[PDB]
Amino acid sequence: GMILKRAYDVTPQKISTDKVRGVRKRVLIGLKDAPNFVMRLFTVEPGGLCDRASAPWEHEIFVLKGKLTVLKEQGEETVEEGFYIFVEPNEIHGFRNDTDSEVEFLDLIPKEGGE
Amino acid sequence: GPSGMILKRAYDVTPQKISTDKVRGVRKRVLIGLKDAPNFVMRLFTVEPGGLCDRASAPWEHEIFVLKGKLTVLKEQGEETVEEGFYIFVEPNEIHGFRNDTDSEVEFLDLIPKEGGE
Ligand SMILES: [Cu+2]
Ligand SMILES: [Cu+2]
Ligand SMILES: [Cu+2]
């Protein structure tokens, strides 16, 4: 009834789509197990990009490592470890890493959006 | 529903003292609370040295990510240690609690469905 695990030990999946390059995803608590919402951990490589998109669901994010550039419907904002991010449903968002070291963030969404 | 995005340093949120029949030595920051959340809430808990959230269970799940320190997890039967970089999934109704057996603060994110409050 309880899972306790090192996130690093969860296998990181390379993500590659027309909008996503240089990103890896770990599914910590996935759709199958989740009553309501899922927990993922993203790694963005230097120069990596999750380009602007809208989703039907909100995001709740916590920046774990590095300087995360957040793309908005207009412009961008770079934040760092210790910031949280709440993206309303339907809002344009994306992410980039302009730095020379990997950026990591925790990302939770309602399970309707889980892989 | 609203549009937009909130980007905020977690430590800018006021750390509220939690004092109940089961909890001492704990502060909570509500990061994404009921005022905002479509479905689930995000809190950041700080457990001071010797702090305790005694065993309990709840009718909803917890999804936890340990940000800092070494946290003792209280289970139905026994205890287990985790540290920074561990995650915890607590099924609904499973007994769980926490204790800080170290001399430094432990911090963890704790997310619950919004039906459970903030
Ligand atoms: Cu159990
Ligand atoms: Cu998204
Ligand atoms: Cu609980």
From TrEMBL, chain A:
The keyword S-adenosyl-L-methionine does not apply. Fe(3+) binds at A53, A55, H59, H93. Residues 41-108 form the Cupin type-2 domain. Cu(2+) 1 binds at A53, A55, H59, H93. Signal peptide: none annotated. The modification Cysteine persulfide is found at C50. It comes from the Bacteria. Cu(2+) 5 binds at E91. Mn(2+) binds at A53, A55, H59, H93. Keywords: Metal-binding, Zinc. InterPro entries: Cupin_2 (IPR013096), RmlC-like_jellyroll (IPR014710), RmlC_Cupin_sf (IPR011051). GO terms for molecular function: metal ion binding. The modification Cysteine sulfinic acid (-SO2H) is found at D107. The keyword Ribonucleoprotein does not apply. It holds the Pfam family Cupin_2. Cu(2+) 4 binds at H59, H93. Cu(2+) 2 binds at A53, H93. Cu(2+) 3 binds at A55, H93. Zn(2+) binds at A53, A55, H59, H93. This is Cupin type-2 domain-containing protein.
